[PDB]
Design a protein around this ligand. Structure first.
Ligand SMILES: NC(=O)c1ccc[n+]([C@@H]2O[C@H](COP(=O)([O-])OP(=O)(O)OC[C@H]3O[C@@H](n4cnc5c(N)ncnc54)[C@H](O)[C@@H]3O)[C@@H](O)[C@H]2O)c1
Ligand SMILES: NC(=O)c1ccc[n+]([C@@H]2O[C@H](COP(=O)([O-])OP(=O)(O)OC[C@H]3O[C@@H](n4cnc5c(N)ncnc54)[C@H](O)[C@@H]3O)[C@@H](O)[C@H]2O)c1
Ligand SMILES: NC(=O)c1ccc[n+]([C@@H]2O[C@H](COP(=O)([O-])OP(=O)(O)OC[C@H]3O[C@@H](n4cnc5c(N)ncnc54)[C@H](O)[C@@H]3O)[C@@H](O)[C@H]2O)c1
Ligand SMILES: NC(=O)c1ccc[n+]([C@@H]2O[C@H](COP(=O)([O-])OP(=O)(O)OC[C@H]3O[C@@H](n4cnc5c(N)ncnc54)[C@H](O)[C@@H]3O)[C@@H](O)[C@H]2O)c1
Ligand SMILES: [Cl-]
Ligand SMILES: [Cl-]
Ligand SMILES: [Cl-]
Ligand SMILES: [Cl-]
Ligand code: NA
Ligand code: NA
Ligand code: NA
Ligand code: NA
Ligand code: NA
Ligand code: NA
Ligand code: NA
Ligand code: NA
Ligand code: NA
Lengths: 295, 295, 300, 300
């Protein structure tokens, strides 16, 4: 049978994630929400786009968790700390039991903390509970680099760590264009400006939309992670993963480079960060730790 | 240089149309709106999804019509009769002059009437001013047929005419699955139910969403028409076109089968409709005519 | 990941790997009896993956053990009675070795004589008839659709058509069952012009052979084959003409014949029975006779 | 629509048409001196369009007039001094007839000896040097990236690499300029293991030749060529290694050499100058000497 993906939270990010996934014909999609009608309408609307696009994907909406049973992947985009903590706990507690073999991909903020909560509530192997944050952030960074350098976005690669904004750990040294260091194309001061724009990337969209936050890129990032699992592509990407010593961090979810596949986090990469980079990471880890304790 | 597409009205349908088009890497996209920040945010958000998806598309947002100059295609999705008439007149009067060689694709409702208005205000050759309505409606119909018959949406074809809802002219006789009449798969009573669900398709999504109307399918339909023009694919699809005698109708925009290409409507097909079908068409034409006169 | 084994790494088999690899549908194993040939073509295609962006393991081999547990087995190892016996021996050898290793696979035959070889494959494999099919109609319909699109001046994406039987004289054209966006093809193309198109379709394979001088078509044949593989792997429920085992449909029994079917994860999930008129049945009966004759030569 | 002419409908040329047709990038004209060959391959591929869903006019011809006004001209008509003279005469004939008909086109050479043949094409066409390039580095980097992905156990979509020079011994590998999602390849693969990969890359073309016994690689070479065509047609500004005319970069003058460039609608839009260390420059200089020798044999 076809793969099955359940998206919990049929808002901007969740519905847009269904759109990116449907276009890829990766599997049947179930959009769940607590609000009646909303997921049903968005799912049917997207389903009706299928004859036009040519993909055979069963997109259904629902308010009943039973419809998410036996999912291969569970995406959680239901978030609006306390508020999201209750929402996240409610979603995972009802979804996890019905899909014991699924890989959970958290999107709700505060991301690192919510992913940790999902791991606790689900009791799933740590490798199968991850969060999306770094793929989006690296995507904004890669976009800015391509724009500035005047090259194809298909030729820019970048790795970064930590969490959102001030918790983000930029790593320009670990970004290249067709294998060439970005420093060969962009000078230090301009690169520093791009790093700052990346840190503020989410807020930049918020300040523009006025009524909500970003969704096209966040959903694309999430969909790419879902694809990595379903097709066991073994993508090397920054993801919120559970650490057991890497970078000197224990008992915490933190954005780190991993090889993402059908088994979820199949490997946590260990970068040879210099002292400057480690200082940024330590400060981030402390802030992420603070949010974790509050949780 | 790359093709250029301007989308006037950065709301649900317009932004979603940018999404479908960006994924196809069909050309640079300019999202224009009267509201500040909104088009800029949605465009940048989508642009930031490009390194993830791998398409090189310049997606920009704006409030200045000058940025839409020299567009190959102009999509109008700014509508909310009087209200939309003023909005449509304002959009076409400012956009048409800057892109004299563009094909205008209207989406604003009342569709047939607004497309007629766009033709008047723009003064463009009639073949280059069309409206999207039938592709969406036929898509819902094709979706329902595929669902019911249990076959791939890639194998269902369908033609229909007229306008939305009561103005829609269904033509089950002109729908097939891999060349086979749909009547071979679905009985008369069930087919009649599918036709009715198609007529009410837009309202069905509205009643579910509660706060707005459909956009995934409407945008997909619009994007497919944009693709047909940019790539001169010569698609055979129902489109709102200016009639000069076809089906006995003159001086009016009506949903009819056409061959859509780089020159816009490259041919209006003349179906051998029986008396039953012509009765439906005549009633529709009268209703569309009524809306036109009011306009 | 899904696994597809392509037996016979010649033009059709390798080109089929190309179409499938681009779709990132699953791991692909190309097998041949000739050493180096499959390994070279597989590696070549695998080396194109970073350029195209697909993650598919494409490997070549001479060992049937590497095709074990495949979801789909494509047979393109084929090379009058002479033609039949030669391909019967190759098909026999291929199926008897591959089938036992992939008991749950759907076998898609391509070797000619198509209908007869598919029958032999069902016979040798012992597989349920629904999981042993042949590719022929998708290619023939593709040529017909191409000619129609060319002539009518419309996108190939808006032309669909159904046909039955086998290759050439065994082909049962059905213009009545072809449309452009739901509109009969006869509305776009005159009778004489359409008859020529039907004739060109019957001789479509030969037309390519005569142009290439050496060898036959492979781009379209591989695309047709790949589309059937995708139909099974993604359980798309495609409505297409495929060589299937008949037990009464169209008045035919105990024979593989090109017929309209719903193709999904279970192989043939339904054999459609279109009501054909007197003229159309005349063509089908004459076609069935020719297919039956070939089948009898095989059983002898 | 955009128009691409592929001179030489052999394995690489036809496979390039296949990759391009699937991308629906523009009309494709396949030309060859042999009658029937291009017409057959073109028709075959055109007949696959309804199956795949792309609307591309694919035609075969023996008349250079049909390649008129092309946006891109791909040359894959090629067949020691013997090798050079034979290909020089073919390349000469192809360019002198095609270039005049498509004055604004970007010429992408594939024929070997690559660097030398691209130089000859610039010489014969009279085209601005930026619009006459050669494909070699994209393929070589593709093999290297494939081996790295295989070994590191990661997606081919996350491996990028740059290299220069020409084929085999003329290749200038640059492991320092290869990464996996921005992380140095050396962090994933040990020195000895990486050296083997570099060696396998140098001999990558030969490896395929030895396996096929007859003929050389075409899937990856065509994919590499097609990606360069797409770069021009869609003005993507790709950063890739291509054979370009040098006027001082890397200390080389009046010669075509594989170097990092930004490829767009204007052909070579920029030749990047990477600061290479002593060891790397040692490789490049020895490579330039070999390329220069080949060039001199050509000019003689
Ligand atoms: N990690 C990233 O990179 C990233 C990027 C953007 C947004 N986000 C976060 O993602 C979340 C969703 O953002 P959005 O813009 O889609 O929001 P939204 O408000 O549009 O959608 C959230 C949806 O969740 C539903 N919901 C609430 N509680 C639920 C419950 N218990 N069960 C099921 N559904 C429930 C709502 O009814 C709503 O439709 C937020 O927490 C946001 O901060 C993360
Ligand atoms: N033809 C079909 O099949 C079909 C299907 C669905 C919706 N529609 C119609 O499409 C239109 C858009 O629907 P929507 O859901 O995207 O709406 P929406 O309200 O989300 O978006 C419309 C956007 O237009 C902008 N706008 C208003 N006046 C403008 C002006 N003068 N210039 C530039 N921008 C302006 C708004 O500020 C808004 O962002 C409506 O008229 C709707 O009825 C047609
Ligand atoms: N529409 C159709 O159904 C259709 C269309 C085209 C071609 N065909 C048929 O498909 C077959 C292949 O055509 P081709 O052009 O690719 O041929 P080909 O000669 O290029 O390739 C056949 C390959 O099979 C291999 N082979 C032979 N015996 C084998 C065995 N016992 N096991 C494994 N491999 C073996 C060969 O060594 C060779 O590489 C032919 O029978 C041809 O007539 C059918
Ligand atoms: N990385 C690279 O740059 C790379 C990779 C692989 C192969 N190649 C080279 O590409 C060339 C083609 O390789 P192939 O395997 O496709 O060869 P091939 O022999 O299959 O095809 C060459 C085609 O050129 C045609 N031809 C000959 N002279 C011609 C002329 N004057 N005009 C038009 N057509 C003519 C032939 O008839 C033949 O169909 C060779 O020179 C080969 O060494 C380069
Ligand atoms: Cl956090
Ligand atoms: Cl109206
Ligand atoms: Cl039936
Ligand atoms: Cl530089
Ligand atoms: Na699936
Ligand atoms: Na913060
Ligand atoms: Na400073
Ligand atoms: Na373009
Ligand atoms: Na939206
Ligand atoms: Na969307
Ligand atoms: Na109405
Ligand atoms: Na009744
Ligand atoms: Na080939």
């Amino acid at each position: 049978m076809r793969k099955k993906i359940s998206i919990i939270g049929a808002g901007f990010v969740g519905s847009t994630t269904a759109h990116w996934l449907a276009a890829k014909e990766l599997g049947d999609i179930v959009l769940l929400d607590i609000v009646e009608g909303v997921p049903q309408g968005k799912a049917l609307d997207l389903y009706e786009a299928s004859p036009i696009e040519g993909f055979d994907v069963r997109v259904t909406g629902t308010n009943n968790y039973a419809d998410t049973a036996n999912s291969d992947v569970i995406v959680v985009t239901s978030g609006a700390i306390k508020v999201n903590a209750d929402i996240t706990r409610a979603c995972i507690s009802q979804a996890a039991p019905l899909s014991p073999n699924a890989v959970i991909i958290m999107v709700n903020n505060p991301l690192d903390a919510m992913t940790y909560l999902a791991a606790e509530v689900s009791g799933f192997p740590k490798e199968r509970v991850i969060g999306q944050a770094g793929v989006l952030d690296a995507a904004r960074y890669r976009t800015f680099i391509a724009m500035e350098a005047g090259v194809s976005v298909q030729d820019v690669q970048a790795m970064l760590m930590g969490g959102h904004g001030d918790e983000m750990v930029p790593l320009p040294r670990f970004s290249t264009i067709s294998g060439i260091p970005v420093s060969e194309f962009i000078a230090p001061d301009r690169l520093a400006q791009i790093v700052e724009r990346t840190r503020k990337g989410g807020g930049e969209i918020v300040n523009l939309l006025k009524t909500g936050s970003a969704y096209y890129a966040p959903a694309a990032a999430t969909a790419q992670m879902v694809e990595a699992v379903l097709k066991d592509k073994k993508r090397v990407m920054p993801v919120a993963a559970y650490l057991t010593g890497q970078y000197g961090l224990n008992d915490i979810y933190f954005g780190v480079p991993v090889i993402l596949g059908a088994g979820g986090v199949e490997k946590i990469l260990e970068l040879p960060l210099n002292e400057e980079e480690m200082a940024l990471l330590n400060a981030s880890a402390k802030a992420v730790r603070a949010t974790l304790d509050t949780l």
